[PDB]
């Protein structure tokens, strides 16, 4: 209702919108320095984290699959089985 009648006046001749804006500017002056600090170290921490991601990717490049590794294991066991059957059947033909 005060928002509806913001251009009306109090008993001391003051507009209700000016009472509201004075209260809002009081709140803004109370809150402004700490939120300035909050956004300051927010910027600091955020692009510090961006930096840290960049050197972690740099270290990943600096130091540089499943079907691959079980294919290697299965051919190793198959080659071993070939070795045992070869000297079980007597396949000595080396030179």
């Amino acid at each position: 209702p005060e928002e509806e009648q913001g251009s009306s006046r109090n008993l001391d001749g003051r507009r209700l919108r000016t009472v509201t804006e004075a209260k809002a500017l009081a709140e803004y002056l109370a809150i402004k320095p700490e939120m300035e600090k909050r956004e300051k170290e927010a910027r600091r921490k955020r692009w510090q984290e961006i930096i840290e991601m960049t050197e972690r990717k740099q270290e990943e490049i600096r130091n540089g699959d499943g079907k691959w590794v079980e294919e290697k294991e299965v051919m190793g066991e198959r080659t071993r089985e070939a070795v045992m059957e070869a000297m079980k059947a007597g396949a000595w033909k080396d030179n």
Partner: peptide, 27 residues
């Protein structure tokens, strides 16, 4: 250009041409 403009006039389609945060303290 005159011939093309007459072609566009003849083939004009009216349906195709039809359709055409912050806080109170911060304020």
């Amino acid at each position: 250009e005159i011939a093309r403009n007459e072609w566009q006039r003849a083939h004009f389609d009216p349906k195709k041409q039809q359709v055409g945060g912050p806080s109170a303290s911060l304020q």
